[PDB]
Structures are given as C-alpha cells and as structure tokens.
Amino acid sequence: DCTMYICGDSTECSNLLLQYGSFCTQLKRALTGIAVEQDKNTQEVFAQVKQIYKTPPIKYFGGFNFSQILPDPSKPSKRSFIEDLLFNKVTLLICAQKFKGLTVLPPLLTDEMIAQYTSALLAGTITSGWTFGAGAALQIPFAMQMAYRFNGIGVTQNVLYENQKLIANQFNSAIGKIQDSLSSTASALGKLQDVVNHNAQALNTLVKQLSSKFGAISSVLNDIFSRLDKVEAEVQIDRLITGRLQSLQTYVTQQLIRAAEIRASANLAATKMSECVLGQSKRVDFCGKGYHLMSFPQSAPHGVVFLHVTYVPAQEKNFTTA
Amino acid sequence: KIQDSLSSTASALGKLQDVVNHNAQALNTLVKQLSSKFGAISSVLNDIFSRLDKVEAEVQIDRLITGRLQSLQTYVTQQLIRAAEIRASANLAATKMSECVLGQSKRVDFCGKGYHLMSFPQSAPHGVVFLHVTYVPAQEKNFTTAPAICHDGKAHFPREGVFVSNGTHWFVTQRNFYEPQIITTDNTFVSGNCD
Amino acid sequence: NFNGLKGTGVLTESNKKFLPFQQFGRDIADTTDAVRDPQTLEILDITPCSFGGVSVITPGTNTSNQVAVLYQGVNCTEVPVAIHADQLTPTWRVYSTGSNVFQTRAGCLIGAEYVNNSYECDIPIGAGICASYQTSQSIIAYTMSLGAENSVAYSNNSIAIPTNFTISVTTEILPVSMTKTSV
Ligand SMILES: *[C@@H]1O[C@H](CO)[C@@H](O[C@@H]2O[C@H](CO)[C@@H](O[C@@H]3O[C@H](CO)[C@@H](O)[C@H](O)[C@@H]3O)[C@H](O)[C@H]2NC(C)=O)[C@H](O)[C@H]1NC(C)=O
Ligand SMILES: *[C@@H]1O[C@H](CO)[C@@H](O[C@@H]2O[C@H](CO)[C@@H](O)[C@H](O)[C@H]2NC(C)=O)[C@H](O)[C@H]1NC(C)=O
Ligand SMILES: *[C@@H]1O[C@H](CO)[C@@H](O[C@@H]2O[C@H](CO)[C@@H](O)[C@H](O)[C@H]2NC(C)=O)[C@H](O)[C@H]1NC(C)=O
Ligand SMILES: *[C@@H]1O[C@H](CO)[C@@H](O[C@@H]2O[C@H](CO)[C@@H](O)[C@H](O)[C@H]2NC(C)=O)[C@H](O)[C@H]1NC(C)=O
Ligand SMILES: *[C@@H]1O[C@H](CO)[C@@H](O)[C@H](O)[C@H]1NC(C)=O
Ligand SMILES: *[C@@H]1O[C@H](CO)[C@@H](O)[C@H](O)[C@H]1NC(C)=O
Ligand SMILES: *[C@@H]1O[C@H](CO)[C@@H](O)[C@H](O)[C@H]1NC(C)=O
Ligand SMILES: *[C@@H]1O[C@H](CO)[C@@H](O)[C@H](O)[C@H]1NC(C)=O
Numbered sequence: 001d002c003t004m005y006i007c008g009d010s011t012e013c014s015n016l017l018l019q020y021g022s023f024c025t026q027l028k029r030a031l032t033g034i035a036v037e038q039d040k041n042t043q044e045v046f047a048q049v050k051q052i053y054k055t056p057p058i059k060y061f062g063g064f065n066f067s068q069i070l071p072d073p074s075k076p077s078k079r080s081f082i083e084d085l086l087f088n089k090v091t092l093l094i095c096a097q098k099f100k101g102l103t104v105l106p107p108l109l110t111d112e113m114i115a116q117y118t119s120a121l122l123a124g125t126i127t128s129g130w131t132f133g134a135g136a137a138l139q140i141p142f143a144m145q146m147a148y149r150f151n152g153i154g155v156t157q158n159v160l161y162e163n164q165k166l167i168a169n170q171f172n173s174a175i176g177k178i179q180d181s182l183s184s185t186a187s188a189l190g191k192l193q194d195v196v197n198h199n200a201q202a203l204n205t206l207v208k209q210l211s212s213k214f215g216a217i218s219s220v221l222n223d224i225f226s227r228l229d230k231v232e233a234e235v236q237i238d239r240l241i242t243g244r245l246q247s248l249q250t251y252v253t254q255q256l257i258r259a260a261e262i263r264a265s266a267n268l269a270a271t272k273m274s275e276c277v278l279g280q281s282k283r284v285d286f287c288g289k290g291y292h293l294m295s296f297p298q299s300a301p302h303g304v305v306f307l308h309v310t311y312v313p314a315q316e317k318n319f320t321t322a
Numbered sequence: 323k324i325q326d327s328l329s330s331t332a333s334a335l336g337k338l339q340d341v342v343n344h345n346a347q348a349l350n351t352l353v354k355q356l357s358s359k360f361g362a363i364s365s366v367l368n369d370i371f372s373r374l375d376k377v378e379a380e381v382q383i384d385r386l387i388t389g390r391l392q393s394l395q396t397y398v399t400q401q402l403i404r405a406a407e408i409r410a411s412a413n414l415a416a417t418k419m420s421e422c423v424l425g426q427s428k429r430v431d432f433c434g435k436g437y438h439l440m441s442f443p444q445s446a447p448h449g450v451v452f453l454h455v456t457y458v459p460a461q462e463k464n465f466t467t468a469p470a471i472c473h474d475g476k477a478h479f480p481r482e483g484v485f486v487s488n489g490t491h492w493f494v495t496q497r498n499f500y501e502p503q504i505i506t507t508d509n510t511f512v513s514g515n516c517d
Numbered sequence: 518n519f520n521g522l523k524g525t526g527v528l529t530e531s532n533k534k535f536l537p538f539q540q541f542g543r544d545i546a547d548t549t550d551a552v553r554d555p556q557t558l559e560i561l562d563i564t565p566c567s568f569g570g571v572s573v574i575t576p577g578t579n580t581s582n583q584v585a586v587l588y589q590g591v592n593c594t595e596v597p598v599a600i601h602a603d604q605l606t607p608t609w610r611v612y613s614t615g616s617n618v619f620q621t622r623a624g625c626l627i628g629a630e631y632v633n634n635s636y637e638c639d640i641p642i643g644a645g646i647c648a649s650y651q652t653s654q655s656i657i658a659y660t661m662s663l664g665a666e667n668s669v670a671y672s673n674n675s676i677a678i679p680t681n682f683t684i685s686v687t688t689e690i691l692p693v694s695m696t697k698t699s700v
Binding site: 001039056060062108128138142 | 522524525544545546547548564565568570589590622623641643645661663664666668669670671673674675676677678
C-alpha cells in the first residue's frame with residue numbers, strides 16, 4: 001500500500017504525494033501480476049487431470065507394498081506418511097509488525113486440497129498404468145503393467161515373472177530407507193528452505209529501511225514540522241519522500257527477478273510430471289540416474305517432490321565376442 | 323470445427339493480445355510521467371527560466387532533470403524484463419517446430435493431448451499457432467487375462483501383445499486395438515517350465 | 518501528544534516491566550508505539566487503529582452493478598463498529614452490516630449469499646472460495662469442485678482393451694516477439 005507506507009497518517013502526505021503523479025500506481029500494477037502468476041503455477045503442475053480416481057479398498061498389488069505413499073485415513077488431512085516428515089521439516093510476532101501496508105495474501109489452493117490432486121495421480125498410475133493421461137483410463141493388473149515397463153528398457157518380460165518375488169522385496173526395502181534418509185539430514189530440503197527465507201528477509205530490510213533520514217533534519221515526518229518553518233519544510237520532506245519511494249522501487253525490481261527464476265523452475269517441474277509420471281522417459285538422466293521405470297509425486301510446502309524408480313545393472317563378467 | 327472454435331469465442335487469442343497491450347500501456351504511463359512537477363515550481367521547462375534568476379534556477383531545474391531521468395531507467399529496466407520472458411518463449415516455440423512438425427514426438431503430452439501424429443504451423447501477428455493432430459482411444463470392453471501359458475510343460479510368453487480371454491478360449495491381440503488372433507508359436511516364445 | 522510526541526492510535530495498558538527510568542517501549546518498527554503518560558504512573562501501549570484493504574467483486578458492468586466487498590484479515594464482527602460519521606474515508610457504510618456475511622480465512626465478504634453445493638470457479642477469492650452471478654439474480658459464493666468423482670475397478674486378472682478410436686485436432690498459441698522501440 002503506497003499511501004500508508006510512504007508517509008501515511010498525515011493530511012499533508014497525500015496532497016504532496018499526489019503531485020508526484022502515477023508512481024505508486026505503477027508499482028501497484030507490478031505486484032498484482034506476481035500475485036496472479038503465483039496462483040497459475042500451481043494450476044499447471046498439479047491440475048493436469050480432471051477425474052478424481054480413488055484407490056480400491058484392497059491393497060494386494062502383486063506383492064508390492066504402497067502403504068508409505070497412499071493417503072492416511074488416521075490423520076484428518078489426506079496426507080501420506082512421507083508428506084508428514086516434509087511438512088514438519090519446513091519452519092514457515094514478526095507477522096504482526098506489518099501495519100505499514102505490507103500484507104500477505106493467501107494462496108488460492110488450500111493445503112488440504114492440493115493433497116487431493118496428488119492422491120488422484122497415484123491412484124491413476126497404479127490401477128490404470130499410464131493410459132489415463134492420454135485418453136480414457138484402462139485398468140490393468142500391476143504385476144503385468146510392470147512387464148510393459150521392463151519391455152521398454154530392453155529386457156524381455158520373461159525375467160520379471162521369474163523374479164517377481166525378489167523384485168517385490170527389493171522395492172519394499174528401498175522405499176523404507178527414503179523415510180529415514182530425509183529426516184537424518186536437514187540439508188535435503190535446502191531447496192525449499194531458502195525460497196521462504198529469502199522473501200522473509202527482503203521484507204525485514206524494507207521495514208527497517210524507513211528509519212533513515214536521507215539528509216532530512218529528522219527521520220519522522222510528524223515532528224519535522226513543529227521545529228522548522230513551514231515555508232521551506234517542503235524541501236526537507238522532498239528529500240524524504242523521494243528516498244522512501246526510491247527504496248520501494250528497489251524491492252519491486254528484486255521480486256521481478258526472483259519470479260522469473262521460479263517460473264523457469266515451475267515449468268521444469270510441470271514437464272517432469274507430464275513425462276516421468278504419466279509415461280516412461282527415454283531421456284537419459286532426466287527422471288533419475290539409471291534406466292527409468294516409473295515415478296510417484298508427493299506434495300510439500302511451496303514445491304513438489306518426486307520418487308523416481310530406476311533400474312541399475314549389478315555385477316558382470318568378461319566375455320569373448322565375435 | 324477448429325475454424326468455428328476460433329470464431330466462436332474471442333478469448334482464444336488472449337496470449338497474443340496482452341503482448342501488444344503491455345508495451346502500448348507502458349508508453350502511456352511514460353508520456354503522462356513528465357506532467358509531474360517533481361517538487362519544482364512548474365512542469366513547464368522554458369518558463370521557469372524566464373521567471374527565476376539564473377543564479378538559483380539551476381537548483382530548481384536540477385530537481386526536474388533528475389525526476390525525468392529516473393523515469394526513463396524504470397521504463398528501460400521493464401523492457402529488459404519483458405524481453406527476457408519473450409525470448410524464453412521463442413526458444414520453446416522453436417523447439418516445438420523442430421520436433422512436433424519436422425518429426426514424430428515420443429515425449430508424452432508435449433505436442434498435444436494423446437498420441438502424437440503430425441502437426442501444421444500457421445502464422446499470426448507477433449506469434450505462431452500450431453494444429454496438433456492426435457490419436458485418442460475410443461470405448462473399451464474388458465476381458466480376462468493371464469500372464470503366460472503352459473502347453474507342453476513349458477511357459478509361453480507373447481512376442482508383442484497380451485493374452486485375452488472371452489470365456490471359451492484364449493487369444494492374443496495388440497495393446498491399443500482389439501484384433502484377436504489365434505494363439506500360435508509365431509506369436510510366442512518359450513522360456514523355462516511352468517511351475 | 519504524550520511526552521511531547523505527536524501521533525495517532527488507540528491506547529491500552531501493557532504489562533511490560535518498565536524500569537524506574539525507561540519511559541518508552543520500542544521494537545524493530547522504530548515508530549513510537551508505547552508511552553509513559555506524565556499524567557499518572559502507568560504504562561500505555563499504542564497500536565494503530567484497525568485498517569485493511571478494500572476489494573470489490575463485480576460482475577460485468579452491462580450485466581449488473583451489484584457488488585460484493587471483501588476486507589482482508591479482519592474479524593467479521595469488527596466491521597459493524599466502523600459505521601460512524603467522519604470515522605471512515607468511505608461513506609458507503611451501508612454494506613458494513615447488510616446481507617448474510619460469510620466468514621473466510623481472508624476476512625469476511627458482504628453482499629454475497631453462501632451456497633453449500635459446488636461449481637467451477639468463476640471469480641477467485643482465496644482459500645478455496647469463488648463467486649459468480651447466478652439466478653431473481655444475486656452473487657453467490659461456494660467452494661471449488663476439482664472435478665467429477667470417478668472410480669476404476671481394479672482386479673488382478675482383468676484388462677480393458679479399446680475397440681475403436683477417434684482423431685482430434687488441438688490448437689495452441691505461442692508469442693514470438695514484440696515491438697521495437699527507440700527513445
Ligand atoms: C469366444 O470366442 C470364440 C472364438 O470366436 C467363440 O467360439 C466361436 O464362436 C463362433 C460364433 O458362435 C462359432 O462360429 C459358428 O459356429 C457354429 C457351430 O455350429 C457354426 O454352425 C456357425 O456357422 C459359425 O461358424 C465358432 O465355431 C466358435 N469356435 C469354436 C472353436 O467354438 C466363442 O463362442 C466366444 N464365446 C463367447 C461367450 O462369446
Ligand atoms: C507395508 O509396510 C508397512 C511398514 O512397515 C507395514 O506396516 C507394518 O506392519 C507390521 C505388522 O504388524 C507392524 O508390526 C509394523 O509396525 C508396521 N510398520 C509401521 C511403520 O508401522 C505393512 O504391513 C506393509 N504392508 C503389508 C501388506 O505387509
Ligand atoms: C575378466 O574380466 C575382468 C573385469 O572384470 C577383466 O579385467 C581384469 O580385472 C580387473 C578389472 O580391470 C583388473 O584389475 C585385472 O587386472 C584385469 N585382468 C587382466 C588380465 O588385465 C579381465 O581382463 C577379464 N579377463 C579376460 C581374460 O578377458
Ligand atoms: C467407431 O467409431 C466410429 C465413430 O467414431 C463409428 O463410425 C460411425 O458408424 C456409424 C454406424 O452406424 C455411422 O452411422 C456413423 O456415420 C459413423 N461415423 C463416422 C464419423 O464415420 C464406427 O462405426 C465405430 N466402429 C464400430 C466397429 O462400430
Ligand atoms: C456489456 O459487456 C459484456 C461483457 O462484459 C458484453 O458481452 C456485452 O455485449 C456488453 N453490452 C453492451 C456493450 O451493451
Ligand atoms: C473473530 O474473533 C473471535 C475471537 O473469539 C474468533 O473466535 C473468530 O473466529 C473471529 N472471526 C473472524 C472472522 O476473524
Ligand atoms: C445447505 O444449505 C441449505 C440452504 O442453502 C440448507 O437447507 C442445508 O441444510 C445446508 N446443508 C448443510 C449445511 O449440510
Ligand atoms: C486376486 O486377488 C484375490 C483377493 O486377494 C485373491 O483371492 C486371488 O487369488 C488373486 N488372484 C490372482 C491371480 O492374483
């Protein structure tokens with residue numbers, strides 16, 4: 001809010017600020033573009049499907065175990081057990097000192113509502129394979145859908161059935177270690193931590209910034225009139241209104257730069273989830289190191305987290321070829 | 323149908339409309355910007371010369387030179403930002419032309435919704451418009467399937483396709499189209515036993 | 518004007534343990550917010566009067582002109598207190614307590630009646646609320662419906678196979694350049 005932040009609560013504020021023209025209404029038209037865009041980014045990443053599929057009550061997926069990513073009925077929020085660690089590891093009176101017209105609008109999509117979108121992607125990629133993203137959903141057994149994935153790698157399907165028991169145990173043991181790995185080290189979520197820390201720090205520098213005098217005899221507009229002649233008191237406040245307005249310009253230009261990087265990183269996520277999730281990817285080292293098999297999405301505060309599943313060859317032997 | 327779709331609603335070309343709106347809008351706020359006095363006596367330039375003595379009119383004229391000079395930098399900085407998003411969107415358009423048009427794309431949900439076939443480009447003011455042609459499966463009928471088959475004490479697996487049953491006896495068919503075929507050694511291969 | 522310092526706000530007593538010398542409380546804001554009155558020997562804590570940003574929900578002007586007003590981050594029972602002469606910059610205090618006020622996380626909007634079914638979003642509000650102009654006519658607020666609910670029957674020995682197909686043509690628009698300007 002330009003009027004309140006600059007020199008608000010002064011009858012001589014608005015009229016003197018009025019003659020400067022259309023400055024703060026120029027800035028106001030730039031911080032609403034950022035506000036609108038930040039709601040569109042979430043609409044392209046999570047909202048790529050319409051029918052909200054639901055998982056069957058029975059959970060016998062050919063020996064596989066998916067209890068650590070499916071929605072949890074116990075918690076009131078439809079959040080899986082992996083997401084619980086993610087929410088607790090992001091630490092989102094400093095909010096009350098924003099009386100200077102620096103508000104924080106709420107996001108359009110509530111946290112408990114994005115979880116429904118994520119739960120639809122999972123329930124559509126384990127009962128319908130990958131066809132639900134490119135037409136009508138088609139059910140298929142999971143022990144047979146995997147054989148399609150192995151075919152794409154270049155390994156014939158006759159090896160999956162003969163090793164179904166070993167692969168099932170091997171996959172279940174792999175998903176368990178992800179839960180402990182995230183909690184053990186706090187640097188895993190450093191990508192999300194600085195997104196909210198940088199923004200919060202920028203606000204603090206702006207509020208603390210107005211205490212400067214900028215060459216004026218005093219740093220407060222209220223008391224600068226009772227000690228100096230009103231004939232030229234306009235001169236000192238002019239040195240003050242310009243300096244206060246100029247710093248507001250700097251903060252806006254910073255947000256324009258940051259929003260460009262986020263939009264670049266939003267489209268990259270919107271591309272990974274359209275290929276690594278709704279299909280199989282042949283792009284090497286795009287959906288995780290090794291040959292790609294399938295991916296599952298998980299939500300997080302201001303971001304998304306993937307769990308790529310990859311196939312990596314084990315020990316080998318020398319041979320003579322012709 | 324696509325000819326009527328464009329002519330039905332006028333909101334289709336919104337992305338190519340605000341490109342010319344934003345640049346035309348930033349010019350107007352630039353012309354009106356010089357009307358502000360910037361704390362000086364008057365916005366008119368030459369009159370302040372003939373009204374005030376040259377000894378201190380420099381002070382008045384300086385606070386107006388800086389006021390207009392700062393206005394230009396804000397406009398230029400805006401142009402650099404806007405030129406950044408347009409260039410970041412022309413590379414995407416160039417990539418689409420090299421992949422979707424000149425060839426067939428295996429990247430799911432990149433050159434349309436569905437399985438990609440082939441595309442056509444069309445020109446437009448300050449932009450381009452594509453016409454993705456895709457293949458969408460129609461209605462479906464369920465069946466009963468088995469992973470393999472064992473006839474001479476040895477498991478058999480399909481070459482391409484999956485075994486389906488209609489109730490009486492089994493068949494092999496493609497994944498994306500129901501064209502049942504009689505089970506045959508040419509369509510299968512043998513590996514191991516069936517225990 | 519306590520202690521010869523001008524300002525504006527409401528006054529409340531605070532329990533901060535002012536030492537026998539210190540007279541003013543201060544924080545990062547660096548704008549006076551607590552005064553020790555020279556009239557008596559108590560502690561006064563100053564906070565700025567209640568304020569907010571006014572947002573107006575309006576349908577098409579030719580369609581109608583009835584509007585619903587939203588105040589961000591204020592208690593819904595606080596806005597009736599604002600109805601006085603020469604207390605608000607606006608004088609349209611008639612909407613302060615009018616139709617059924619519906620409370621949301623981003624404040625409470627007035628002039629809109631809250632249905633409890635769902636539709637598609639027409640005008641976004643915040644925290645999963647949208648408003649539109651539906652049928653004799655009024656502005657309604659609901660909760661977004663993500664999509665039509667669906668269920669897929671999963672069994673371990675059944676497969677679904679298409680028996681037909683269809684061909685569709687989908688359009689797409691991309692900007693490529695802009696005007697060249699010289700100054
Ligand atoms: C499941 O699919 C099989 C394979 O098509 C069906 O078996 C075949 O069904 C057709 C249609 O009834 C039979 O053709 C007719 O057979 C009679 C027999 O007298 C003949 O007189 C007719 O001129 C005509 O050719 C075909 O013989 C039969 N094949 C075999 C090996 O039995 C089967 O009916 C399908 N089951 C269901 C429930 O749809
Ligand atoms: C999938 O994995 C989970 C995680 O271990 C299994 O849940 C365990 O169930 C046993 C059986 O009583 C409990 O003793 C463990 O405490 C459970 N784990 C946790 C973390 O609470 C679950 O049983 C597995 N699914 C299947 C079908 O076995
Ligand atoms: C057998 O395979 C090994 C690799 O597994 C080949 O390399 C030998 O093993 C390691 C890996 O390089 C080296 O430290 C040895 O010195 C290698 N052996 C030799 C003789 O160089 C090995 O060459 C293969 N053997 C043959 C006969 O081809
Ligand atoms: C597959 O679907 C197409 C339409 O998408 C069907 O073609 C229609 O068939 C009916 C048969 O009575 C005709 O009256 C229509 O004119 C056809 N439409 C078109 C566009 O040609 C086709 O019949 C379906 N396949 C099968 C085997 O029924
Ligand atoms: C009023 O505006 C609407 C769009 O907001 C338009 O559809 C309608 O034709 C307009 N009516 C007029 C200009 O009479
Ligand atoms: C208003 O404040 C009361 C305090 O008891 C609280 O219970 C209520 O939820 C608040 N309502 C709004 C709309 O802020
Ligand atoms: C929904 O609203 C109608 C009136 O608009 C009311 O009769 C009904 O009881 C409500 N249902 C709820 C609150 O579950
Ligand atoms: C399918 O699941 C049911 C329920 O667990 C089980 O009784 C049946 O044996 C299973 N059949 C196959 C082929 O997996």
